[PDB]
């Protein structure tokens, strides 16, 4: 179960030791706050509640992403590609541009301009350590000698792992790739087909367990939910780069490679210098071949339909909400908090006039609207007929607010001005509940022998001595 075998979904919850990954609310779901848990009964549990008001859509629709390291030279291409995916197909191959000729299909001009000179990129920035555990002893025990850690050298550099050092990641250019017309405010439209998302990817609501035939569950109906660069990706944006190479690299970028380095003394102490005696492998009377029948292309091959299926419900939706706990945390202390470095003043002003949602004067609403809203989904199929155009502002996003919000008076009970650390939260407690320690499964059991019995409590007649692999 779970539509598309080649999936990943998401994750139950974000990383708790970082901080609480949810904003607080006051009017749950309804901004108008109708509020009526029948009277004596409460109705359905609807613990999620506010989650249906939490953005809505933007599954496959990407408003942002990033992935760099300590070095990363780059410049965004002029194409502006809307990617997507649809592997296998299992019918018609493809359609469109019959001839696909590159300027140089084979590299006659070459992408690499020959390693002997700085092509463009040269410098690298990373750190790691190798390993050993040198075993010993042959007779009786095939490894019993505590031998690995030789006396540590000055090699331990500490600063080997430099703390990012970007700077560019704020006051130059952030992602903001769907900066255009959006039929929602944030996400939907701008460019590409957006999160089209053929229905809620529920598979069978939650799990399903066992359904009739594979026609429902993936193997028949495998129209992928966009995936593989679903919205845009590689849109005209600078990653910030910062760590640029240029010709100034010459110190390293001279050439400590191809000619070995400056120490190239023509076979230094590696080729024949290390060997005095030994003259085996002159000939061997043991051939290999296939000693029995074989078939490489027997099977065990298939086309894995690669998809990005998030599924609104993974295994069970837990109460994903952390408000304040302490309460007086809103009042804060000397901290200020109101200055959040740099942030955009929402979408561009005058863009959306609130014509697409609008609303209605539901002062006292009856069950008529509550039930018909289940039926009205048919009306919603037609989309916003009124296409919201990209109506620009005089002030560009970040400069749209004239005055900043001063903290204290703006209590802001979800910012840096917080107390009680994380209010306990959750540690490595439930690690045992994750199928941990319990004998949940051990294949099924012993299938037993046939040609022999082999039923003896002593496995072999050698109590083999350990001490062969340490930490």
């Amino acid at each position: 179960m779970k539509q598309s075998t080649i999936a990943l979904a998401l994750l139950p919850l974000l990383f708790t030791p970082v901080t609480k990954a949810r904003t607080p609310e006051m009017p749950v779901l309804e901004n108008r706050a109708a509020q009526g848990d029948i009277t004596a009964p409460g109705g359905a549990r609807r613990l999620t509640g506010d989650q249906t008001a939490a953005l809505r859509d933007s599954l496959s629709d990407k408003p942002a992403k990033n992935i760099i390291l300590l070095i990363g030279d780059g410049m965004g291409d002029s194409e502006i590609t809307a990617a997507r995916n649809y592997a296998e197909g299992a019918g018609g191959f493809f359609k469109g541009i019959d001839a696909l000729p590159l300027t140089g299909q084979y590299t006659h001009y070459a992408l690499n301009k020959k390693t002997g000179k700085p092509d463009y990129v040269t410098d690298s920035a990373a750190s790691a350590t190798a390993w050993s555990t040198g075993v010993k002893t042959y007779n009786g025990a095939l490894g019993v000698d505590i031998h690995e850690k030789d006396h540590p050298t000055i090699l331990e550099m500490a600063k080997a792992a430099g703390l990012a050092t970007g700077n560019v990641s704020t006051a130059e250019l952030q992602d903001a790739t769907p900066a255009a017309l959006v039929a929602h405010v944030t996400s939907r439209k701008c460019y590409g087909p957006s999160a089209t998302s053929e229905k809620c990817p529920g598979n069978a609501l939650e799990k399903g367990g066992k359904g009739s035939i594979t026609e429902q569950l993936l193997n028949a109906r495998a129209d992928v939910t966009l995936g593989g660069g679903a919205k845009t990706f590689a849109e005209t944006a600078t990653a910030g780069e910062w760590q640029g190479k240029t010709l100034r690299e010459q110190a390293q970028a001279r050439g400590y490679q191809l000619v070995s380095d400056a120490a190239s003394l023509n076979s230094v102490t590696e080729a024949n210098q290390q060997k005095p005696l030994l003259g085996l492998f002159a000939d061997g009377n043991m051939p290999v071949r296939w000693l029995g029948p074989k078939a490489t292309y027997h099977g065990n091959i298939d086309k894995p339909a690669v998809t990005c299926t998030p599924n609104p419900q993974r295994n069970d939706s837990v109460p994903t909400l952390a408000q304040m706990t302490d309460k007086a945390i809103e009042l804060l202390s000397k901290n200020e908090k109101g200055f959040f470095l740099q942030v955009e003043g929402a979408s561009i002003d005058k863009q959306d006039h609130a014509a697409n949602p609008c609303g209605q004067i539901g002062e006292t609403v009856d069950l008529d609207e509550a039930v018909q809203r289940a039926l009205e989904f048919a009306k919603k199929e037609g989309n916003t007929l009124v296409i919201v155009t990209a109506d620009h502002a005089h002030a560009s996003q970040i400069v749209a607010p004239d005055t900043k919000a001063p903290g204290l008076t703006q209590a802001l009970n979800t910012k840096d001005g917080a107390v009680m650390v994380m209010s306990y939260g959750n540690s490595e407690e439930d690690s045992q509940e994750h199928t941990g320690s319990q004998l949940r499964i051990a294949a099924y059991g012993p299938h037993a022998a046939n040609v022999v019995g082999l039923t003896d409590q002593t496995d072999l007649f050698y109590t083999m001595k350990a001490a062969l692999g340490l930490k």
Binding site: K2, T5, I6, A7, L8, A9, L11, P12, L13, L14, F15, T16, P17, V18, T19, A21, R22, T23, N31, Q51, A53, A54, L55, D57, L59, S60, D61, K62, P63, A64, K65, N66, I67, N85, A128, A161, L163, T186, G227, G299, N300, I301, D302, P304, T307, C308, R314, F340, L341, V343, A405, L408, T409, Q410, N413, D416, H434, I441, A442, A443
Partner: protein, 155 residues
């Protein structure tokens, strides 16, 4: 995590590795008669451990159950862990960092480690597609937080 030398966030990748592996093939020999891509059941989990101030080691557990027809083929599971200094961050860029930047570098390793246990069990080639975690959790923390006027009293 204070204010002093914080500015905004404290990020660095210190180490990449595996913390835990599992692979149980009850029909390991029985695969010979069944040649196709098996039924796959994906489950994930959130495990972490605190090492130091701002240094948290966060783990992506990826459980894969495989079945050829209505019979289990094999079972596989990886915990792609990593030592990181990740704290101080807030607002929109929080979910954008630990939901986009961090998963996209750790994913090929969890994926390959699964595919390796499968390929060591000598089963049909099974490798998972790069999904976008970023927006999925980014949506869940969106509730009118764009205009933080608050308006309680003063203090």
């Amino acid at each position: 995590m204070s204010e002093q030398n914080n500015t905004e966030m404290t990020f660095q990748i210190q180490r990449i590795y595996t913390k835990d592996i599992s692979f149980e093939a009850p029909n390991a020999p029985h695969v010979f008669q069944k040649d196709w891509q098996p039924e796959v059941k994906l489950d994930l989990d959130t495990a972490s451990s605190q090492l130091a101030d701002d240094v948290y080691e966060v783990v992506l557990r990826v459980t894969v159950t495989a079945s050829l027809g209505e019979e289990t083929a094999f079972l596989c599971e990886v915990q792609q862990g990593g030592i990181f200094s990740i704290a101080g961050i807030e607002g929109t860029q929080m979910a954008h960092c630990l939901g986009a930047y961090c998963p996209n570098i750790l994913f090929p390793y969890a994926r390959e480690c699964i595919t390796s246990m499968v390929s060591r069990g000598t089963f049909p080639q099974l490798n998972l597609a790069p999904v976008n975690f970023d927006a999925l959790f980014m949506n869940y923390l969106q509730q009118q937080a764009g205009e933080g006027t608050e308006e309680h009293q003063d203090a």
